[PDB]
Structure formats: C-alpha cells, structure tokens
Design a protein around this motif. Structure first.
Motif, PDB file in Angstrom:
ATOM      1  N   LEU A 312     -40.183  62.741 -94.207  1.00  0.00           N
ATOM      2  CA  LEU A 312     -39.769  61.615 -95.033  1.00  0.00           C
ATOM      3  C   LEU A 312     -38.627  62.007 -95.953  1.00  0.00           C
ATOM      4  O   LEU A 312     -37.698  61.221 -96.166  1.00  0.00           O
ATOM      5  N   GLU A 314     -36.328  64.129 -95.309  1.00  0.00           N
ATOM      6  CA  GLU A 314     -35.134  64.129 -94.484  1.00  0.00           C
ATOM      7  C   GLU A 314     -34.723  62.704 -94.113  1.00  0.00           C
ATOM      8  O   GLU A 314     -33.560  62.332 -94.260  1.00  0.00           O
ATOM      9  N   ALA A 315     -35.678  61.872 -93.690  1.00  0.00           N
ATOM     10  CA  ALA A 315     -35.332  60.533 -93.203  1.00  0.00           C
ATOM     11  C   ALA A 315     -34.787  59.636 -94.311  1.00  0.00           C
ATOM     12  O   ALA A 315     -33.817  58.893 -94.094  1.00  0.00           O
ATOM     13  N   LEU A 316     -35.420  59.647 -95.483  1.00  0.00           N
ATOM     14  CA  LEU A 316     -34.955  58.860 -96.622  1.00  0.00           C
ATOM     15  C   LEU A 316     -33.696  59.418 -97.252  1.00  0.00           C
ATOM     16  O   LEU A 316     -33.126  58.768 -98.143  1.00  0.00           O
ATOM     17  N   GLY A 317     -33.254  60.596 -96.819  1.00  0.00           N
ATOM     18  CA  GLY A 317     -32.073  61.218 -97.372  1.00  0.00           C
ATOM     19  C   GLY A 317     -32.184  61.681 -98.808  1.00  0.00           C
ATOM     20  O   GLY A 317     -31.175  62.126 -99.372  1.00  0.00           O
TER      21      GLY A 317
ATOM     22  N   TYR C 294     -26.872  55.492 -96.314  1.00  0.00           N
ATOM     23  CA  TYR C 294     -27.885  55.729 -97.314  1.00  0.00           C
ATOM     24  C   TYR C 294     -27.502  55.073 -98.643  1.00  0.00           C
ATOM     25  O   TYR C 294     -26.315  54.986 -98.973  1.00  0.00           O
ATOM     26  N   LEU C 296     -31.393  53.699 -97.459  1.00  0.00           N
ATOM     27  CA  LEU C 296     -31.759  52.847 -96.342  1.00  0.00           C
ATOM     28  C   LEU C 296     -32.062  51.435 -96.811  1.00  0.00           C
ATOM     29  O   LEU C 296     -32.516  51.209 -97.937  1.00  0.00           O
TER      30      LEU C 296
ATOM     31  N   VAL D   3     -34.434  61.076 -88.544  1.00  0.00           N
ATOM     32  CA  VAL D   3     -34.215  59.751 -89.120  1.00  0.00           C
ATOM     33  C   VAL D   3     -34.151  58.694 -88.021  1.00  0.00           C
ATOM     34  O   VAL D   3     -34.772  57.630 -88.129  1.00  0.00           O
ATOM     35  N   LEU D   6     -37.587  57.952 -86.788  1.00  0.00           N
ATOM     36  CA  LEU D   6     -38.495  57.260 -87.701  1.00  0.00           C
ATOM     37  C   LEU D   6     -38.104  55.801 -87.947  1.00  0.00           C
ATOM     38  O   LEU D   6     -38.991  54.974 -88.178  1.00  0.00           O
TER      39      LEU D   6
END
Ligand SMILES: O=C(O)CNC(=O)C(=O)O
Ligand SMILES: O=C(O)CNC(=O)C(=O)O
Ligand SMILES: [Zn+2]
Ligand SMILES: [Zn+2]
Lengths: 335, 17, 335, 17
Positions: A312, A314-317, C294, C296, D3, D6
C-alpha cells in the motif's frame, strides 16, 4: 532459578538484578545439544537454551583488553543514550517520519576509543550509556580470525542444513553496559544468540502475540519494534498488552539461545552484572513451503500483514496514506 | 499464486548494516 | 423542480411523490447532448442527464401490453419483496455468509406470468412488490429486435469510442412498481441509464464518499451495496453517514442519465407514479492509464481496497479471517 | 508494477447474470 557456578562460586546472578515488568513469564528450557527435546524445539521453531554447544568456545576468553589488542583498527558502531532503553531504529526510514527523534545516537569509532569512553564514563560516574553493536568483518586482527575460525561450525552448519535455512548473513558483536535494554522486537531471520561474557535476561513472545505487542508501522524507523513502553505501558492505547505472556531465561557465558524467526524478544544486561558480550548468528529462514497448510501459522499472517503495508505504501505513492486507507477499509465494515 | 506472494518473508533484523 | 410536460399537461410529478431522507442534495445538470458542457461532464466522469439523445426512442412506445405481445417466450428474472427496498445480493456469495437471509426472492417466469402476477396483486390490494430485472437477449420477438436495432447506436458508439470504454456487456431491462427502491450501491461499469416509462428519482454520491456509505465486505453477498438503511440510519455504526451529500435528479421518458463507474446511486420509482421502465447500457471502463498520476483518484483507492480484500480472502483461505487480520493490522498501529 | 496490479478494476454490477 539462577544456576550455581562450578567450583562453588555461588549463584552467578540473583533476582534483584532483574527489572520488574507487568506480565507473567514461564522459563525457556535449558537443555544439552545432545537432547532429542532440544532438536525438537528447534525443528518446531520454539526457543531453547543450549548449554553445551561450544559454539563460541574460543571467544569465552574475550574481554575488553583482549579485544582492543586484537580486533583491529576498523570502525565500530557505538550507540549512546541517556536512558537504559536502546530502541533500534532504521536510519533509511527517518525521511518517512520527520517527527521521529531517536533517544539514542550512533557514533563510529575505533575500539580503543570505545573502551576509553567507557572508562571516562565510569571514573566520572556519569549516567551516559553505551552499546557497541558491530558486524564482525574482515578487518579484525589475526587472533580474532583464529578465534572465529574455531567456533563450532560443524554443529551450527548441521543445524542450518537440518532446518533448511539459507545462508549465514552476519555475526553481530554486541558489547553492553550493565542495565542496558534492547526493547522488544522481532527479527526476520533465525538467530543463534551466543553469550560470551556476563548475563542477559531474554524475554521472548511467540509470533501469535502480535496483537498484544503493537509494532510500529512498517514504514516507521522502528519497524518490527513494539510501541509499548514496558516500563510504563499505556493500556488505553495498547489494551492487549494486559494479555501478554513471555518465555524467559538468563543466558551466561557458554549458553546459546535459539531465538526463532518472528519471535519477539526483549533483552537486558543484568543490573550490576558488569559488561556483557554476545555474538549472534543470523540465518535466512527456509524457503516458503510447496504446499501451504491451512489455516496459516501466526508467523505467516505476520508476513502477510507486512506485505500488505509495503504494497500500500508503494501503490499510494506515500507511506502516510497507508493508515487512512486501512481505517477507511475497516470502519463500519469489519469492526 | 497470490498466497505465495503474500507470505513471502523479508530478512530485516536489528543490525546497523 | 419538476419539468412541465409539453401540450400543457402540467408537472409530470410533484415533490410529494419523493421519499424523505436525512441528507442534503444538489441537482444533476440536465443538458442537451449537443452541449459542450455535457461532453465535459462525461469526459470527467461526472453525472449528467441528457434530455435529447433519442437513445431508446423506439422503446418509448413500450408498455406491458406491447412487451407481452412481442418480447418472446423467454424466462424473466422477477424479484419479490414485502418491503419497498430491493437490496441486490449475489447468490454465488451466499455460501460465505450462511446467516444472510435476503428480504427479496427471485422467481423465473414468462413475461405474461409477470403481468398476471402484477394484475393479481393490484386487484387484491396486496402489499407484495415485484421488480423485473432481465438482461435483454436473443429470445426477444421480432418487434423488440427491430426496436432494439433502432436505438441510437451512432451516438452511444461514439461515446464509447471517445471515452476509451470497453465493450457493451449487457442491456438490463428494469420494470418496477411505483415506490420500488434499489438501495444505494456502486457498479464497476460505466452506465447510460435510459428512462422509458414513468419517473425515477436518482440520488448519486461520488466515489470520494466511500467513507460515508459503508459498503458490505467484498465477500458478502451485498458487496458494493451500502450497509446504511437510508430510511433509518444507524449513526452509531455509520457516523459519517451524517456527512453524506447527494446529487439528485428525476428522469422521465426520453431522458438518459450518465451514471459514472464507481458512483454510488440510489434509485426509486416515484410514489403513485405507476410502473416504471428503464433500459441501461453497461460498458466496461477504459484501461488503466500508462502513467499513474499521484495522488490517486478516489475511485482508484476504491479499486485498491477491493483488491486488498480479495487478496486476503484468497491468501487466508477463508473470507471470514479477513476482518480479524485487518483489525489486528490497524489496532494501536494506524488508528 | 504493484500499483498497476492493485488499481486493476473489476466489472461487477447489479445484474442477475
Ligand atoms: O543483545 C541485544 O541486546 C539485542 N539482540 C538482538 O535483538 C538480536 O540478537 O537479534
Ligand atoms: O433502476 C434501478 O432500480 C437500479 N439500476 C441500477 O442500479 C443500474 O442500472 O445500475
Ligand atoms: Zn533481535
Ligand atoms: Zn446500479
């Protein structure tokens, strides 16, 4: 109870040298390495103290004078603090938490400088505490090389082989002052913890106590350490710390404590016990099994939770968005 | 193989390295 | 306000035919399909009512008599309930929640059987409610084929092309009784909602209101539906429902409502407005972008949360272990 | 490409199908 030293030297230590905590404990078994029960505990990833491995037999003669004469002219990492608690922190993660102010600081110095700082603290009666924590490397002098080569590699290599572990990644040399504490944390490697000088009280908690011990967020510099102040536990924030139960032992010279991967451990150098010396042996854990058995073991659920947090972030930055997303997922939905 | 991915272990320890 | 019908027919509906709810709303814009602002709203995935698309112009002559004569001898899915709320539920997930007892039941029947059951309910003054919800398929008779072919494919195919959407996956025929409600939920496809007969009040909430609307767990049969009872909201369990704000419109014959993917929508057939008829147009959303920007968008965070829940259900081997693991991750750590 | 994995969208809707 405290072991009675050979040659009628009396108890090595007494209960008055242990710090006082809020939770119960039961003893870790102390066994011979030849005992089938010891092998069974290691195989099942439960802690055991082995009393007769001779793992670091050549190092039992180590003291500061010997080490200063022979350990070479390399740099040693030495942590300093005005508290007995040397909470580990990861310097690469401090950019994620600009508000985190560590209570201990690291200084690189030569070994003789470390001995001299110790001495100057003693003579002056100061309250500063020092903890040396340095990976053994190829800068050590020849006598330390010979000592290291004389460790019981036959025995520990057979353990690595029998357990399917990966490689030895490092040996950490730890030299602490009486009363130093490393607060509760878990490590993602298997550990044979070889006591050399002085006595350390080791309190372990199984991987299934995750919910009682409240590790910091993965992105925080104190990832893998408990947030709970064992000396003053905040039961409003950490209510399940009232349910924690430890497994306890005191290791002295010649003892080896198997600290299984993912097991929490709190380690303290006995009050008024003098300096302590330990060398640990960190091994990567065995590969993940071909056939996953359900339901999953506690340590597998710990691994899942770490990976969710890492993904998370990484994905949410942004690491700081992890908590808000997790709360949104759960509130009124899963709680 | 989502399960194998998620139960993958790290190797972080309390080492200065 | 209510639109005034042509030929001095007066207001089509009045405010007394709308149900009363706890939250404020503002109107969805009603525009011509030739209006640049309408194109801008669709492009930005915001709702808009288009008044002059002629999307289902041949179907505006549909009523029960016409449909029964021409829609063929296929089976139609008809839901029955003793409440006005027809909460959607996924029958394949009912094994995960053996405790879930749906308030509506599905019965397969021929179209004339549906008309006759409606009639028998009317003449008898019963309280049973019926909602027909059937994908249009190739069993429909020839006149329905010709009507369907006469939809405005030129206009909607250009929309699909301009927005990068994937394929039309289905057209759902919806025939409801006055006062029927489909409770708030979101859909993972883009939707052009084409009103044919009667009036429906449509209340939409953006994807950023996730935290006010408390969807069921992903593994639950009511995945994607709000847990909140709009008629009696439980503010102790769902406190952020006190912050919800909707976007509202009433669509009548000839209107098309763009319901963007992930947007929550509550849909009700006006009290005392007669039966309603709608055909929707569901399209898969555009592929995920090459360059993620970003931070998101809200709908991307919704997608992440769904995938976390799905992954954990699969990894833990049991949907029911998802909540406990999420709570353990967060308690005292992120909250 | 965690990313991309997901934020992958599903396609579930309130349809009997
Ligand atoms: O000995 C200490 O104070 C700390 N040691 C460890 O946490 C370890 O070896 O993994
Ligand atoms: O029309 C209704 O009652 C329900 N419709 C929908 O939720 C839809 O078309 O996606
Ligand atoms: Zn450790
Ligand atoms: Zn819908």
């Amino acid at each position: 109870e405290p072991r009675e030293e050979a040659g009628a030297l009396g108890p090595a230590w007494d209960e008055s040298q242990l710090r006082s905590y809020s939770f119960p404990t039961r003893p870790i078994p102390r066994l011979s390495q030849s005992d089938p029960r010891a092998e069974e505990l290691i195989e099942n990833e439960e802690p055991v103290v082995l009393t007769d491995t001779n793992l670091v037999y050549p190092a039992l003669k180590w003291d500061l004078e010997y080490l200063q004469e022979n350990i070479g002219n390399g740099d040693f990492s030495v942590y300093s603090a005005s508290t007995h608690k040397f909470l580990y922190y990861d310097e690469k993660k401090m950019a994620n938490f600009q508000n985190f102010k560590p209570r201990s600081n690291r200084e690189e110095m030569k070994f003789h400088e470390f001995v001299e700082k110790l001495q100057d603290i003693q003579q002056r009666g100061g309250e500063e505490r020092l903890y040396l924590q340095q990976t053994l490397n190829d800068t050590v002098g020849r006598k330390i090389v010979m000592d290291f080569l004389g460790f019981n590699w036959n025995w520990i290599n057979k353990q690595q082989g029998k357990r399917g572990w990966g490689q030895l990644t490092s040996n950490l040399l730890l030299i602490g002052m009486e009363g130093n504490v490393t607060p509760a944390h878990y490590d993602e490697q298997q550990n044979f913890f070889a006591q050399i000088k002085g006595y350390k009280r080791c309190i372990l908690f199984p991987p299934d106590q995750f919910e009682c011990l409240y590790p910091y967020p993965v992105h925080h510099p104190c990832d893998r350490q408990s947030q709970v102040d064992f000396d003053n536990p905040d039961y409003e924030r950490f209510p399940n710390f009232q349910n924690v139960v430890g497994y306890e032992t005191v290791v002295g010279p010649g003892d080896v404590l198997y600290i299984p991967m993912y097991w929490w451990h709190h380690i303290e150098s006995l009050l008024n016990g003098g300096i302590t010396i330990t060398v640990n042996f960190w091994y990567k854990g065995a590969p993940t099994p071909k056939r996953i058995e359900y339901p999953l073991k506690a340590h597998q659920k710990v691994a899942i939770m770490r990976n969710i947090e890492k993904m998370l972030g990484e994905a949410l930055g942004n690491p700081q968005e992890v908590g808000p997303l997790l709360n949104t997922m759960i509130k009124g939905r899963y709680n | 193989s989502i399960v194998d991915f998620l139960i993958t272990a790290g190797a972080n320890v309390n080492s200065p390295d």
